[PDB]
């Protein structure tokens, strides 16, 4: 089984004990490490942080300690947008420019593969034709990687993609059956199901729907997402179940109603270290004092509230439950966003180093 872990190149700017660099990564924790995020310049893969070239070397240097470890570079993310992907996939010439720049870049910096994190083809401004052009891009990359492995004798570069769980996004941009044949694995983002963009509280990553949910709402859960990707043609062994080491927060319309689905007025207070209203790292929630934690019976995940703050997150128990689930479905393993959001240095939760991801490793093994 695979344990795919995302590293983020901006965590290096967090203050104090929250700062995360390649030196903070446990070489033996995961089977695959994915570096987020690379960008694109004139249809060619490019760095996004001033010191990426140096970080790339340290990152792939982890393989000197654990030779079995595989690394990949992820391109995209939310802030990257969609325009550059749309323009690049528009013509065969532009796609070749990208594909060849990707091979060179990955070989130059010693990455074992490429992870596509376009958010998303067919959505967020990307036109309908991008659903099929994304398929062409994936085919172009698979073809090129196969060819390069053959001409160079080197191990074939891996190709994966971080894909959405929401039916709306999946239908608008992914020909699942087609792309699945060309991807080595699929990183299912089985999280971000609910967030402060919604007017009521909801859990970031519920395993199942609430009994009272119906319609489209009843599909905003992990089980529905997994069933969807399998039903549309994804080989179980290629479906890697994403797990979040962070939660999503809301400010309540009233401290008197702290239920799942209670009216909310917007994002919860930004965390002291992550500083992003609407989310909190596991290490920012695991030790909340004077708070009240409760488990959502039907969804098998917890939430915690204090005064007018409400946060739905994942803990050791929910991660255990989800791995049992993925094993029961025969999935290819677990994926996690992100290394720097777990209590990596064991400074906050009194649960040792990487309490959440270590749980994934132990449960998978």
């Amino acid at each position: 089984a695979k344990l795919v872990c995302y590293f983020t190149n901006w965590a290096q700017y967090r203050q104090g004990e929250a700062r995360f660099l390649p030196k903070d990564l446990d070489p033996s924790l995961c089977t695959h490490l994915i570096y987020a995020f690379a960008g694109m310049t004139n249809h060619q893969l490019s760095t996004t942080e001033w010191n990426d070239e140096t970080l790339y070397q340290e990152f792939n240097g982890l393989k000197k300690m654990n030779p079995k470890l595989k690394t990949l570079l992820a391109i995209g993310g939310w802030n990257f947008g969609t325009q550059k992907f749309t323009d690049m996939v528009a013509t065969a010439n532009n796609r070749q420019t990208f594909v060849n720049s990707a091979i060179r870049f990955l070989r130059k910096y010693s990455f074992d593969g490429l992870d596509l994190d376009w958010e998303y083809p067919g959505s967020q401004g990307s036109p309908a034709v991008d659903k099929e052009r994304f398929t062409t891009l994936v085919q172009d990359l698979a073809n090129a990687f196969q060819q390069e492995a053959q001409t160079s004798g080197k191990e074939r570069l891996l190709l994966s993609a971080a894909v959405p769980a929401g039916q709306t996004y999946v239908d608008a941009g992914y020909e699942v059956d087609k792309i699945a044949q060309n991807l080595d694995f699929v990183n299912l983002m089985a999280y971000d199901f609910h967030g402060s963009w919604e007017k009521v509280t909801g859990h970031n990553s519920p395993l199942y729907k609430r009994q009272e949910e119906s319609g489209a709402a009843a599909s905003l859960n992990v089980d529905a997402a997994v069933q969807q990707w399998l039903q549309k043609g994804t080989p179980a062994s290629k479906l890697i179940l994403g797990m979040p080491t962070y939660g999503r927060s809301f400010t309540l319309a009233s401290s008197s109603d702290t239920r799942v689905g209670a009216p909310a007025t917007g994002s919860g207070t930004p965390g002291p270290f992550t500083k992003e209203g609407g989310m909190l790292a596991y290490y920012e929630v695991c030790s909340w004092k004077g708070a009240t934690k409760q488990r959502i019976q039907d969804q098998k995940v917890p939430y915690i509230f204090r005064d007018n703050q409400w946060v739905g997150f994942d803990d050791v128990e929910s991660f255990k439950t989800k791995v049992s689930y993925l094993k029961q479905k025969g999935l290819g393993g677990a994926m996690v966003w992100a290394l720097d959001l777990d209590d990596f240095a064991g400074f906050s939760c009194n649960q040792g180093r990487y309490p959440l991801i270590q749980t994934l490793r132990q449960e998978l093994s």
């Binding site: 939310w78 999280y191 971000d192 963009w197 979040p244 992100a338 959001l341």
Partner: peptide, 5 residues
């Protein structure tokens, strides 16, 4: 937004 998105 806030994480992977």
């Amino acid at each position: 937004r806030x994480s992977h998105x």
